Structure formats: C-alpha cells, structure tokens
Amino acid sequence: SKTIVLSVGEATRTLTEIQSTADRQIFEEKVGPLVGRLRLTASLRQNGAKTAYRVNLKLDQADVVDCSTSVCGELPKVRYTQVWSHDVTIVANSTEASRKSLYDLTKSLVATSQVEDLVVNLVPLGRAYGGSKTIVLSVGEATRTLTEIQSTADRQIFEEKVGPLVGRLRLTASLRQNGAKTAYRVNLKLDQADVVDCSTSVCGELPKVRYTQVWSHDVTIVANSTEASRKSLYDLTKSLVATSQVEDLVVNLVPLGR
Amino acid sequence: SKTIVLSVGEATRTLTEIQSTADRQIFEEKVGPLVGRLRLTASLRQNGAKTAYRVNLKLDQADVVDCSTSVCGELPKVRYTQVWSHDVTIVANSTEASRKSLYDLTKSLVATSQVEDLVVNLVPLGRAYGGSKTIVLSVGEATRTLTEIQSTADRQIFEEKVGPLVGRLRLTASLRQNGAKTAYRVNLKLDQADVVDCSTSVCGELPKVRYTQVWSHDVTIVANSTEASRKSLYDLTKSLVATSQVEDLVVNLVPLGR
Amino acid sequence: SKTIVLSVGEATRTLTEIQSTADRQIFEEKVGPLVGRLRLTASLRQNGAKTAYRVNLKLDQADVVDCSTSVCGELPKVRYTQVWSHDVTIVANSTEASRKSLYDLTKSLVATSQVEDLVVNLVPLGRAYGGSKTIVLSVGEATRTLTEIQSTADRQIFEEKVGPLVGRLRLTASLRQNGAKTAYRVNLKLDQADVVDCSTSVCGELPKVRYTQVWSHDVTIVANSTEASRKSLYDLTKSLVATSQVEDLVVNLVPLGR
C-alpha cells in the first residue's frame, strides 16, 4: 500500500498503512509478531476560523517479549510502550520560508547530542562551553545558539539573543514523573515568531510579531526500560523527521504515505 | 553654565545645567530638537538623624523621530524613554578608602562585558570559565572574582569567597517585565560591608561589620527598542560613572557641574 | 586505654576513650587545657525489626581562648563549637561489596576539592569543566561522575547517569542558616541503591532495587569563625573517614578504638 521508510543506518524499517480516515492515518510495521509492532498515528486538522492547521504525529513503540522456550505454555506479550508525539501548529497565511525554517530547526534539534542524552540517559539540556549553557542548532553553515534564560524546578527555558527583543527563538524543556515513579515525561517545545519591520517604508514603526509557529514534543519513557529500547525510539524519531514526507507534511500540508 | 562632559569615544556630549534647587540639579544637552534631549537629575540628601547620605542620579534618554518628509505636516515626537537610575548610600563616618573602593567597583562593574550584554542583548549574568559562574571586577591589577551562590527565578545573587564569612561583596541582579510585556527592568545592586577585627588589640573578639554602602541601579528598557538605542544608553552611563565629577560626588560629596 | 589516631599530615592527634556504654562510645583528646578538647561520640544501633543498623559519629571541636596575660584574672574559655556528624544506614542482609563501595565513595567525597571549599569558603558544589556541573568521585582508577539534575534555592541534587534509570547514585547537598545569622548548616547525603537484573534467569524481568544505604553529613559552622578553625575541622574529618577503624565500623560493624 502506502509506505514510509525510516532508515536507521543501513537497516530500513518500512511501515505500511492500515487506516485512512478523513484526518487520521495509521501506519504499522508488518515484520515480526502480531501483538507488538510500531505505530504512527498521523493527523491533520484546521481548528477555529480556518486560519491555523495542526499536524499531530505519534510514534508508539512496544517492547514485546516471548519466552515460551523458558516457561512452557505462554505466548508473546507486551511489557511497556514508549511514545514520541509531535504537535505542530501552522498558521495558514504563513511564508514558505518560515514553514521551512521551523522544520529545519526541529530536524536539527532532534539530531543533536543534547536531546539524545535527554531521552536516553535523562541528562538535562545545556552544556556550558566557555560561557552560558548553550544549545547549537546548525541549519547547515548557519548556527543559531540559544542561551539559557531560566531554569526552575520544572521548566528550562532557552532563547536566542541576537536580533530584536520582541521576537526570538524559544526552547521550553521540562521533565516530570507522574504516578508511582514508573514513567517519565520529556516535553520539548520550540516557538518561532516571525518579526517584521518597515521603518524604511512607514516612519516610527518598531518591529512586531505577526504570527507564531510551534513544534512541541511529548516523550514517554518508563523507568525500568532497556537502554537500547530508548536508543531505538530516539533513532526512529530522528529518522522520521529527516524523511522527505514529514518535510512536505509541514511545508506543503501533504499527508503521509507514498 | 555648569557642564558635564560625557565622552563616548572622541564624540563628547556636553550637558548644561537647567535647574539648581537645594537638592535637585537637572542637566540637559542642547544639541538637536527641543522636545527630546538627554537628562540628568542629580540629587543629594541626608535622611534620618544625619548619619547617612543618599546620592540619586537618573540618566534619561528619549528617542525622538521626525518624519515631516514622509507624511506632510507632522512635528518631531518621542517614541519611548529609557532611563538608568542610580541609588548610592554613603554613611557619614566612613573611611575615605571605603568610599573610593565602592566607586572603583561600580566603575568596573559597568565597564565589563557581562553588564553590557545584560542591557543590550538581555543576556543574564555570569559566565562559567572552568568552574562556577563568576564575574571578575578588576580595579587595576587586583581582580575580585564573585562566584554565584543562588539563581532563583527572580534574583541572581553573586558573592566573593575570599576572607571572613561575616562581610563579603554582594551582587543581586534581577530582571522583570511589568505590564503588557512592553518594558523590561534590570536591577543591579552591589553591597560592600566594612569588616574589622580587633583580635590583635582585644582578645576573644571575632570579626564584625561596621556599616554597609550600597550602589544600586535601575535600568528601564522598552521591549521594541533599537539596538543602538540600548547601546548608547549603556555607553553614556559607562562614560558618566568614569568621570571625575561623579567620583567626587561619591567620595567628597561635591555636587555635579563645573 | 583505647585510642584513635587521626593523622592531619605529619602531626598525629590521638584521642583516648572516656566512656563505653552499650551503644555510646565517647573519645577525647588529652593534651591542652581541660575546658575545650576534641570529642568523638560514636554510636551503633539496630532500630525496628532488627533489619538495619545505624552508625552515628559526631566530631565536635571547640575553639578555646585564654588571655589571662591580656586581662588580669580570667580563665580559659570556649568561644564557639563546630561539629561534623555522620548518619550511616546499613541494612543487615547486605553484600560486603555494597558496604565497601559506600565507604569508598564517602571517603572520596570528603577528600575532593569541592567539599573542602563547601565547608571552608562556603562555595557551592559543582564545577562545569566542558559540559554540565559535575562532581568526580574517583575510587582509584574508576571515576564515577555525578551530573547536576536540580538546583533549587535550598537543595542541590546530583546524580550519576550511566546504567539503568531505576537505581542511581545521589548527592543532595544543602546549606542553611538558622537563627540570627550566626551559624550555617551544610548537609550532604549520598544514597546508594543496589540494583539487580534477573533477565538471564527469569524472562521478562526488568531491573529493580533491593535496598538503599545512605551516608548523611551535618556540618555546623558559625559565621564568625577563623579560617584555620574551619580548615582543621575538615582536615580531621577527612582524616577520620580515612582510618582503618571507621572502615571496619561500616563494613564489619566493629566499634571504634583499639
């Protein structure tokens, strides 16, 4: 049918489509047992007065185990599930260079070594290399350095420092553990506001923001995980954003599946 | 009349006196339009039972724009104002080296590259160069390194670590935004307590503080500013503290203007 | 009688026993005046249903001053007292390598240069050397690096990052000042949980913790101390943990004094 190919190096994991509703669009891998497989619940909406879209991905990953060899008479069974959701907000009258920049920053956010250690080894964000706690988001040769402005007990807010003060980049990380200390909750969020000024056109006009576009994340990690269970969940989501189909889902609003 | 010269390099900006009351003393620049100019409302008091003075400067700066060329029939007008207040507290029975050291620390506080980025690019204080978040306040060849002891969501307290524990240098920076997110509020404050020990004179006497002398700051920065509007406000205040008249205003209590 | 030898370099300070109850065991140094001397109040218990022990050391130190040659007719007298308690919790069914590793980490916790500046110069913990704020607890050639996970206004929690997420090292430092700003209170605490994985024996078994063994600290430092008064209290406690008698008090529960 319609497939997405997630290259995790030389191993390619092909998800095939099992559902096509008007908005929801469920993919699933077909290799292995039937009880625990990959899942990709894509979506698209336009809520309100037709002015803002809402992309919504959700990459589940179940850790199935089958030990009928050891104990006689059992079947394969799912231990836990670890998800990595996305919540993109795109306003309808945007510039295509603003939708491309929001994709290129989040593709480089996931591909850095500070978000990798945040979901694998639970290390918080920011490494001080001669100065403040900074994150570097390379968009090729252009590097956009975000310095930390606030670190309370829950939140950890990063922000770029160049340009005007009214519209700047953001990175609101946090980390929780809800329930009986059994599952964590990583929560990244990158705000990009588009600022414009026309003081060469209209006198007395200071810069102001016209719209904002977000890209949230919501990672769920159970506490007694395997390390290669969290490492493979990161490597699939890093390879999901790097595809050419999630690029067109954000830039041109084309649904997934080729 | 009576002038102060604030050299910002080779460009010298001379403010002339427009008011002289018993305590208040207003200066103003005379070059340019008549609606928005520099302002410097110096003051001096002795509150309470005549034991402590209170120096109080306030360097205003308005950004005037005139575009009668663009739209026909308008007059010059100011958009915003950005101030940099001071609040020096001097106790009357001080040592002359106590008042000189308080001036020599604040003259080197404003002249550093960390307070410059705090008002221009809104970067918080302290850069960790192999260790803790530190600020170096050199007074020539003597460098006084203040290490950060507490970073709350509102305050950011620095303190020196060499010497006794009863009296040490302090630096409680802050950053707010009051109202509808339109104006910031930077707030530095440097406490210097005079400690003395008499153990070579009287036995069993541990060190203790005599008095404290404060040099606070209160910078008001509007959010939609120009970068050269925030840079020139800092570079005028850096050149104001480095003059010989604000030295004698703190050390010898001579009012401004010669 | 029964002695403990604390080498503070080449000078050895020998404390002799002055009390031996069923649990409490008080030592005291015998040189100098009779009003202020070293004091070491060891103890051992097993509270509850005989499942966990509780070691409790307390190294007092009083600063005695005698200036009868200054003022005619006074006697020696103590100004202040600086203590360093310990509170070790050992569960009875432990492994001997678990009790040895807990002693080897605390012996290396006290011997580092970051805890020395915490009690002498009141500098907080953690120095960022290319990355985040880390503490290195070397056990010889094995180095166990704990990275900071939370810096509240009171607490400062460190944690190791390798291995599973369910049981890791901990270091919750704190710093208070109770009363009329006269005395500080340093409080270190190292948690070590024993985690086991039975996946090679029982299928579908994720790692879990068996027990926890703590080693708290409680340093009391008065604010008007001498520097060599706080330096000698640290250098005695560093020389107390490194002895062979406090090793056997934690590993083999042998009481102090040979």
d(CA A246, CA A88): 11
- DSSP state, residue C24: -
* Residue B201 forms contact with C (CB below 8 Å): no
For residue A112, what are the contacts with CB-CB under 8 A and spacing of at least 6?
Answer: A135, A136, A137
At B79, phi and psi to the nearest 5?
-85, -60
Q: What is the DSSP letter of C93?
A: T
Rounded CA-CA distance B146/B164 in Å is 14
Instruction: Find the distance separating the first CA and the last CA of chain C, reported in whole Å.
Output: 8
* DSSP reduced 3-state for A4: strand
Report how far residue C173's alpha carbon sits from residue B59's, in angstroms, rounded to the nearest whole number: 44
Task: Please give, rounded to a whole number of angstroms, the shortest distance from the CA of A176 to a CA of chain B.
Answer: 19
Collect all residues of chain B within an 8 Å Cβ-Cβ radius of residue A151: 151
- DSSP code of C28? E
SS3 state of residue C116: helix
Q: What CA–CA distance (Å, rounded) separates A256 from A251?
A: 13
Please state, in angstroms and rounded to a whole number, the distance separating the CA atoms of residues B58 and A175. 44
> Shortest CB distance from A65 goes to which of C128, C166, C204?
C204
The 3-state secondary structure of chain B reads CCEEEEECCCCEEEEEEEEECCCCEEEEECCCCCCCCCEEEECEEEECCCCEEEECCEEECEEEECCCCCCCCCCCEEEEECCEEEEEEEECCCCHHHHHHHHHHHHHHHCCHHHHHHHCCCCCCCEECCECEEEEEECCCCEEEEEEEEECCCEEEEEECCCCCCCCCEEEEEEEECCCCCEEEECCEEEEEEEECCCCCCCCCCCEEEEEEEEEEEEEEECCCCHHHHHHHHHHHHHHHCCCHHHHHHHCCCCCCC
**What is the number of alpha carbons within 13 Å of residue A109 lying toward its C-beta?**
23
Query: Which member of B79, B127, B221 has the closest CB to residue A204?
Result: B79
Q: List C190's β-bridge partners, or say none.
A: C215
Q: Which two tokens stand for residue C16?
A: 């002799």
| Chain A with chain C: Cβ pairs closer than 8 A | 46
Beta carbons within 10 angstroms of residue C220's beta carbon: 17
Residue numbers in A near B129 (CB within 8 A): 130-131
Task: Please report, as a single letter, which amino acid is at residue A134.
Answer: T
Length of chain C: 258
In angstroms, the separation between the Cα of residue A166 and the nearest Cα of chain B is 6
How far apart are the C-alpha atoms of C37 and C10, rounded to whole Å?
Answer: 20
The Cα A236–Cα A233 span in angstroms is 5
Method of determination? Answer: cryo-EM
Burial of C47: CB neighbours in 10 Å, binned 0-12, 13-18, 19+: exposed
Distance between alpha carbon B178 and the CA centroid of its chain, in Å?
21
Evaluate whether A122 touches A108 at the Cβ level (below 8 Å). Answer: no
Grouping H, G, I as helix, E, B as strand and the rest as coil, residue A200 is coil
Tokens 């319609």 correspond to what residue? A2
Do residue A166 and residue B223 have CB atoms under 8 angstroms apart?
yes
A131 vs B127, B223, B225: nearest CB: B127
Helix (H/G/I), strand (E/B), else coil: C237: helix
The radius of gyration of chain A's CA atoms, rounded to the nearest angstrom, is: 20
Give me the residues of C, 73-102, that contact B with CB < 8 A.
77, 79
Would the CB atoms of A166 and B227 count as touching at under 8 Å?
Answer: no
Residue in the block written with tokens 């599930």: A81
Task: Return the number of other C-beta atoms located less than 10 Å from residue C69's C-beta.
Answer: 8
- Taking residue C134's Cβ as centre, other Cβ atoms within 10 Å add up to 18
- Pick the residue of A206, A209, A212 with the most B CBs within 10 A to test the interface with B by mutation: A206
| Number of C-beta neighbours around residue A179 at 10 A | 8
Contact C103, C96 (CB under 8 A): no
**Contacting A residues, span 156-175, partner chain B, CB-CB under 8 Å:** 161-162, 164-166
Task: Give yes or no for C206 touching A (CB within 8 A).
Answer: yes
- Positive or negative: CA dihedral A240, A241, A243, A248: positive
Phi first, then psi: give them for residue B250, nearest 5 degrees.
-90, -45
Q: Quick one: DSSP state of residue A124?
A: P
Q: Are A101 and A254 within 8 A, CB to CB?
A: no
Q: Is the CB of C132 less than 8 angstroms away from the CB of A121?
A: no
- Of the partner residues A70, A123, A129, the one whose CB lies closest to the CB of residue C203: A70
SS3 C58: strand
Other CB atoms within 10 A of residue B45 CB: 12
Say if residue A210 is exposed, middle or buried (CB neighbours under 10 Å; 0-12, 13-18, 19+). Answer: middle
Q: How far is it, in rounded angstroms, from Cα A32 to Cα A229?
A: 16
**Which residues are within 8 A (CB) of B204 and not within 5 positions of it... i.e. 6 or more apart?**
C65, C67, C77, C79
- Alpha carbons within 13 A on the beta-carbon side of C39: 17
Handedness of CA B178, B179, B180, B183 (dihedral sign): negative
Alpha carbon A228 to its chain centroid, in Å, reads 19
3-state secondary structure of A209: strand
Residues of A in contact with B124 (CB under 8 A): 132, 149
C227: chain B residues, CB-CB within 8 Å: 164
Question: What is the CB-side half-sphere exposure of residue C174 using CA atoms within 13 A?
Answer: 15
Residue C118 CB-density burial (10 A; 0-12 exposed, 13-18 middle, 19+ buried): buried
Q: Which two tokens stand for residue C141?
A: 């050639």
Question: Taking CB atoms and an 8 Å cutoff, what residues of chain A touch B126?
Answer: 132
Distance, CA of A12 to CA of A182 (rounded, Å): 31
Q: What angle do CA A102, A105, A109 make, to 5 degrees?
A: 135
Residue type, B14: T
C147: contact with A, CB 8 A cutoff: yes
Residues on chain B touching C127 (C-beta within 8 angstroms): 130-132
Q: What was the resolution (in A) of this experimentally determined structure?
A: 3.0
Intra-chain end-to-end CA distance of chain B, in Å: 8
Residue with the two structure tokens 């915490």: C118
Amino acid at residue number A92: A
As given in the structure block, the two tokens for residue A212 are: 């904002």
Count of alpha carbons within 13 Å of C77, Cβ hemisphere only?
Answer: 9
Nearest chain B Cα to A196, which residue? B224
Helix (H) or strand (E) holding A156, with range, is strand A155-160
Residue of A nearest to C146 (CA): A123
> Could you tell me which residues are beta bridge partners of residue C156?
C151, C173
Which residue on chain B is closest to A146 by alpha carbon? B123
The DSSP element (H or E) to which A195 belongs, if any, is: strand A189-196
Residues 213-242 of B with CB under 8 A from C: none
